[PDB]
Amino acid sequence: MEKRQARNSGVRKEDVGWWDPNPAADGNMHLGLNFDRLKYWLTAGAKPTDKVAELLGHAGVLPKVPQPPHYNPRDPKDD
Template sequence: MVVRIRLARHGRRNLPFYHIVVANARTGRNSKPIEKIGTYNPLPDDAGNKMINLNFERVKYWLTVGAQPSETVEKLLVKADLMPQAPKPWMIEAAKKFKEL
């Protein structure tokens, strides 16, 4: 069973609000998750900040157990210093080509 940390969309049209959830990879986007571990509001407030609330202990637990974050959640976790920034495959290929020159 592959477990993913991903976003579940809530809110209304043109006003998205996401719950950061742990769910089975084969279930639907808004199906019942295993656990809700945070929220994310992508719309900036008056100061221009986007709101991210995370339960750090549970995120660390799920990452150590082997849950795989989606690309968007991975970016959020890197910003929160819960994950190191991993190089993308295209970055590795570009570095190899640069070394050959």
């Protein structure tokens, strides 16, 4: 998955990972990545996008990223 392909296309990348954002009864997030090619791709300069960087930091195999520079009232009812 480079910049060219879409989300669901056939990709040379092996895994975005075993992933399940749905909460599951306790320890609510999923099991994380399978491994050993994730470090190769992030080593090779393949970029992460914003939330995979948050998820990789949150799993603690990478350090986390601070998101907010300022606060203005976000609307939670947009959905």
